[PDB]
């Protein structure tokens, strides 16, 4: 964008060089008026081209997660990481209907017109945008689903009905495999537009199956 | 200017008439003691006597209030105790 | 009488803050035209005769 | 094993209704309707004022006072007949229908201009989730049966329910807009746009308010219907006598008393008022227009190709 | 702190406490709300209740006091405003 | 150039609004004190007065400011201290 | 840390004091934003709150101060900025 | 003419940007005071003030750099010192 403003400036010098020769209205408003109606042209295309790819070319957001109380933790929170993504979203359109460059004195509706004209696209950037936060509002799910976090007391449970030969075998394989599973936990997920990390998570979800280990192996022992 | 109340011992009524007598009295009046006098008498008015007001933008006070008849607060920047004592 | 005390103080808090701006890391350099092959050098291996 | 299964079931039990899961509003009104200043001072924050809308999200957070549970309200909103469907479509799905209600707002600078305008965006967003209660194919339908029966039995709580008017299956509560322009109509018309209101209010079943600073039912009201975030029903009494305020709550409003169907429309309606270039083709250049063209184009035709599901 | 009384309806004795009071207040404690409690809680001690005591550097002020014991000066920038009532 | 936030105890919209309005000043003027000057008074007419700014690359500073009123960042070298007072 | 004013809306005997005051912070204190501190505290200690200081080799500022409480000057090679406001 | 590099201390990309702007200089002018007006205003406007450039023929230095902001090289038998200080 400051390579659009920079070129904006240079246009506006060059007409600055016209006007300076000493000519009159009729002389001054054929350069710049002609050279406006081909900057709509130069501009709307900016504007379609977001409206197709705003998603995909937004500044980047990250996001921490984490597992407090057997609860899903942000820092930020997600609410806000979202809230800042949609202004990006409005930043860009509220661009093509604020121009100052050749002709600045003149009437800023040659521009802003293209964002209502173009307003098909509005669908198109906001249905993405759903589809984005739908899919992580799915794998935020998925890791509060996968390895469950509130892991309630166990002790009584394992006391009561469990550590014979047979059933224990049973039971401690399934641990183990629980072990293998969260050693793969990704340590974050990209997505068009964010980026949150899991590593947090990957950490508790590990120490829970290992707090689960020594349950089952220490009062096995004793059985 | 915009209406923040930092405490209140005092009926959401008189609460809220508070706040649109001072709002009234710093839209008329520009020198502190004529926008207190202001406040003051319109509750001597509809609420009875003894009331007291002080308005401005740089002082603290230590009072003593009849129960359910104290509040303060800003108008932007310039602050509003209201009370009944007497 | 049922009556109260209480007080107020218009500032409320005075939030105080120390601010240090970092520091600016400058060295001392020679330099000079007419000289040897090491123009300037702050203020035994010799592998490097061994490839010819 | 057990133990998984223990650990499963009350993860999964529990986590419904730190706080319950919250709710989220959408604001139905019109471009630069004062609605803006309403929602960013109800949600306590200084921001300007935008005119325009174009499906904008904002939120805001309260506490309960044992502790700061984060209690998040999302909210949308849209002003204007602009891309209705396009935009009120996306945020609005059956699965979440259940925490979602509607708010209506009236600018009061054009009653005229405004009823063609807010009876478009109501049938849009009426319409929509209407269907999306089983649009999806949600075979258990039981939460849809829920839902219907709930919020048609909640406004005739006296009156005999005859019939439904209008079917009408999400909340709804009206306020209106910059009300200091109201005074300043005929008096023949504030009352025929106060009987507007109120025969609004009935159809749809939803509450009335005025908009002021000592009327504090304004913010309450949209925390009632924003999941009583703002504290609950507190019903009042309604002021279709002194026609001075405007207030309603919903189920007292009985046509022989607001209005004393089609014939009370009728009546309102005719009385207020019945009369309800970027091609630059012009213009020429060679290396300017080809380029972009080219450039249109190319980027364009390789976006489609995408195929993107969206 | 150099004491100068503008306006008083109270005795010489009860004047002359006022300025060593709020004086030994002003030296003592250095936000208006302290140095006001420590004003009325003397007079409250040795004139009787109901007093009441506002300092500060900016504000204006309506209020109802009882004859004879009135009394506003400053010390220095800072005014101090004392009175019985109730 | 580029704009880095290290201190804030300030909204997001003044937070922004201080870098949009530096980066203006540090465009327009070379000299520290007329970059200060272009971001004080802007600060005064958005948000009330009144603003204090310093802009420079090497001083310490030990200041009192109003609650959710004061930032400190950079813009590229150069640091800029915005806070309000009075 | 040979002394010279710039600018001043001070008395003389506080403008002597300052010098020495801020003379004194130097010999004691390596740090600029130390150096700040010890003379604002200074000041708020005799004349009162509240005082700002500045202290450093590179920077300007724009600032608001109440009348006859302002100062700048040099030590040496080190600018310091004194003032009252708020 | 042919660019080496003797010293440096400086990015990789500053040092070719230094080298070619000398070269662009070297080509435009004749006289070394121009040449070096030339390098010097470029760098000030892409990497900040302040810089300072030398170009002749027969000299010796000793000067005092920031650091990542110095360079000594020549353009056949022309050298040019280029630094930041200030």
Known sequence: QQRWKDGLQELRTGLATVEAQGFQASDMHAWKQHWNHQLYKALEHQYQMGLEALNENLPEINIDLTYKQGRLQFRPPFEEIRAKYYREMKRFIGIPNQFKGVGEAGDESIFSIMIDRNASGFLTIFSKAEDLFRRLSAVLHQHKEWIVIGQVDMEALVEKHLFTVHDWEKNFKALKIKGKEVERLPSAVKVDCLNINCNPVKTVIDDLIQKLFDLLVLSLKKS | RKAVIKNADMSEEMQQDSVECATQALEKYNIEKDIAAHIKKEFDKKYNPTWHCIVGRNFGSYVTHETKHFIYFYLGQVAILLFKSG | ?52 | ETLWEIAKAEVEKRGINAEIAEKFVFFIGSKNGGKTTIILRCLDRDEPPKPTLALEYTYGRRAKGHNTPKDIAHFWELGGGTSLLDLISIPITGDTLRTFSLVLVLDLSKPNDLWPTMENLLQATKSHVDKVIMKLGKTNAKAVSEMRQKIWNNMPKDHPDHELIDPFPVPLVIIGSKYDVFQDFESEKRKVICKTLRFVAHYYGASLMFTSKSEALLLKIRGVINQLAFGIDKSKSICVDQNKPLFITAGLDSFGQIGSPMELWKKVYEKLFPPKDPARDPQYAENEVDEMRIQKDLELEQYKRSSSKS
């Not at chain 3, 890391?25 to 007419?34: G, L």
């Open chain 3, 1 to 52: 009488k049922n009556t109260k005390q209480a007080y107020v103080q218009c500032n409320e808090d005075n939030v105080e803050r120390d601010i240090q701006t970092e520091e600016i890391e400058t060295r001392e350099v020679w330099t000079q035209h007419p000289g040897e092959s090491t123009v300037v050098s702050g203020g035994t291996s010799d592998a490097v005769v061994m490839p010819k």
